[PDB]
């Protein structure tokens, strides 16, 4: 009755590991656009169809805030943003003294844009030429060592030299699939209302991830995927006020953004063959850049967020408030709609406190009112708070429009000892990972360990 040990190869067991995942684009945008699309040029074109397992009796622990896959995505986005800005223009020649006044286009003042004139260098090194272009505010700063005269300079001259984004390159969130190498497997949850940690009783394997979109914004995720059964509120530690609260929605609110005025676009020849595109005129009238949201739908989407958020904060009215003040990047909702980088003021989107009873007045009555935000625009943007990573977005002729499904709110909680009947929830965000962490909440990477040992009570004849 002696017992003998045996060995098996190819058994289904696994352990977590930090490998290097890869991409695996959608393989539909790989015509000439392969070299055009930002954040897709390095991806392999493949066709990662799903898998229907559903393992059965598996009970796998998941965690979102200790995930490393999101950090690999973040590193990929950083290193592939730099890779696309390498082969085209540096705007060092533009770092000159700008003699600028208010534009005063056709007998009328425009409050936002300055008509700057500067001595640009022609192709021939000897001869300089006087040239002009309409620069926004924010992009322009008064120059030092002068008696408040009309002498100005670009924002970044005192910190770095910004490269113009290659105008052939396109800023669009083409979906990205992440795949683990051979010998590893990607696991994903299937339970509904997953709060970001703890076991998932229904687990699946997949060759690659769902078509994640590399959208970057702040205070409102957008064009993302939606929950299944109900609004899901998700935070590392709700009792800690420093944690972002990813309020994943079930139903999408729709936002419509635009830039009504009919900008032109003129090219300034600099150096041997390089060109610099800047606005030349506004052939029309003056506008306000704005974004429109339905008031009824936003009331519903704050009432339901109040109901779901009151479960973790029982016996309390819920109060929303505007952001906490600071620069445009910190306080305002960012975009890249149509290639232009808006900065929208989210007050009074997050305003008012909704009673704990949550009397839902949505009914047959007509409530077609729309809440209209108003938005600034920049061109010289320091990306991800890296001043060395700055770039200049070329202007775009014509007026812009940008439809979009929203959201998952990136809230933050506030309130002292004094209130304690209602808690103040402000918009937050602006960090990179939180925009992509909200879609990698399902997934997990595991290393297969296919070599195992077990008893059988049987000997090898020898």
């Amino acid at each position: 009755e002696n017992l003998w040990v045996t060995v098996y190869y190819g058994v289904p067991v696994w352990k977590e590991a930090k490998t290097t995942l890869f991409c695996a684009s959608d393989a539909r945008a790989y015509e000439k656009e392969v070299h055009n699309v930002w954040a897709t040029h390095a991806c392999v074109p493949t066709d990662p169809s799903p898998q229907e397992l559903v393992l059965g009796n598996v009970t796998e622990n998941f965690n979102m805030w200790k995930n490393d896959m999101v950090d690999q995505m973040h590193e990929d986005i950083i290193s592939l943003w730099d890779q696309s800005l390498k082969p085209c223009v540096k705007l060092t020649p533009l770092c000159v003294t700008l003699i600028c006044s208010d534009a005063t286009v056709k007998t009328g003042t425009v409050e936002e844009m300055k008509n700057c004139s500067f001595n640009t260098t022609t192709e021939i090194r000897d001869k300089e030429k006087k040239e002009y272009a309409l620069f926004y505010k924010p992009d322009i700063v008064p120059l030092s060592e002068t008696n408040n005269t009309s002498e100005y300079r670009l924002i970044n001259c005192n910190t770095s030299a910004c490269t113009q984004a290659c105008p052939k390159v396109t800023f669009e969130p083409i979906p990205i699939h992440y795949c683990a190498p051979a010998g590893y497997a990607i696991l994903k949850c299937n339970d509904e209302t997953f709060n970001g940690t703890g076991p998932c009783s229904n687990v699946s394997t997949v060759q690659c991830t769902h078509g994640i979109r590399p959208v970057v914004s702040t205070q409102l995720l957008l064009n993302g995927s939606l929950a299944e059964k109900e609004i899901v509120i998700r935070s590392e530690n709700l009792t800690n006020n420093a944690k972002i609260i990813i309020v994943h929605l079930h139903t999408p609110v729709e936002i419509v953004c635009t830039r009504p005025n009919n900008n032109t676009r003129k090219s300034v020849r600099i150096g041997p063959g390089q060109t610099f595109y800047a606005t030349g005129d506004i052939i029309g009238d003056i506008k306000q850049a704005h974004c429109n949201i339905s008031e009824e739908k936003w009331n519903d989407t704050l009432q339901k967020v109040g109901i779901e958020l009151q479960k973790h904060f029982p016996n309390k009215t819920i109060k929303y408030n505007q952001s906490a003040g600071g620069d445009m990047e910190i306080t305002t909702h960012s975009f890249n709609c149509g290639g232009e980088f808006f900065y929208c003021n989210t007050s009074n989107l997050f305003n008012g406190t909704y009673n704990g009873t949550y009397i839902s007045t949505n009914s047959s009555a007509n409530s077609t009112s729309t809440i209209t935000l108003q938005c600034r625009i920049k061109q010289i943007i320091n990306m991800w708070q890296g001043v060395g990573r700055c770039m200049y977005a070329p202007p775009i002729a014509g007026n812009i429009t940008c439809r979009s499904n929203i959201t998952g709110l990136l809230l933050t909680r506030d309130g002292g000892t004094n209130s304690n009947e209602t808690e103040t929830f402000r918009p937050a965000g602006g960090d990179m990972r939180d925009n992509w962490r909200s879609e990698l909440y399902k997934y997990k990477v595991v290393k297969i360990e296919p070599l195992g040992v077990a008893p059988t009570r049987c000997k090898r004849r020898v």
Partner: protein
């Protein structure tokens, strides 16, 4: 339904069917342990990770025996300190992943015994061929 073309030819689909039943399907999972400008490093090191991982498992099975059969009896008896369960408990109730949590203990001690016993067998086979 759905069939083997997903149920194991995807991956790992016997992960909850108990090792009595999961040990029947081994081949199609073993078949998938190998099939693998700075981003070129993200492909080359992804390729080479799979290749070296695969060979470093075939290295052990060639040293232990018997050799590449996917199931081998080893003629190494169980030490008393490892004896925690009856065989009826294991193959009929537990899963391979569950069993890995218990038998991960002592694991580096087993591999030495398997390696050493193979040298004795190979030397003995030479003796038999010499005497014969």
């Amino acid at each position: 339904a759905v069939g083997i073309g997903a149920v194991f030819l995807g991956f790992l689909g016997a992960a909850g069917s108990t090792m009595g039943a999961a040990s029947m399907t081994l081949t199609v999972q073993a078949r998938n342990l190998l099939s693998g400008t700075v981003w070129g490093i993200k492909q080359l090191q992804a390729r080479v990770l799979a290749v070296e991982r695969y060979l470093r498992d075939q290295q052990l099975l060639g040293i232990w025996g018997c050799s590449g059969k996917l199931i081998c009896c080893t003629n190494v008896p169980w030490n008393s300190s490892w004896s925690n369960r009856n065989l009826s408990e294991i193959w009929d109730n537990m899963t391979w992943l569950q069993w890995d949590k218990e038998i991960s203990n002592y694991t580096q001690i087993i591999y030495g015994l398997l390696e050493e016993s193979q040298n004795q067998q190979e030397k003995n086979e030479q003796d038999l061929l010499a005497l014969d």
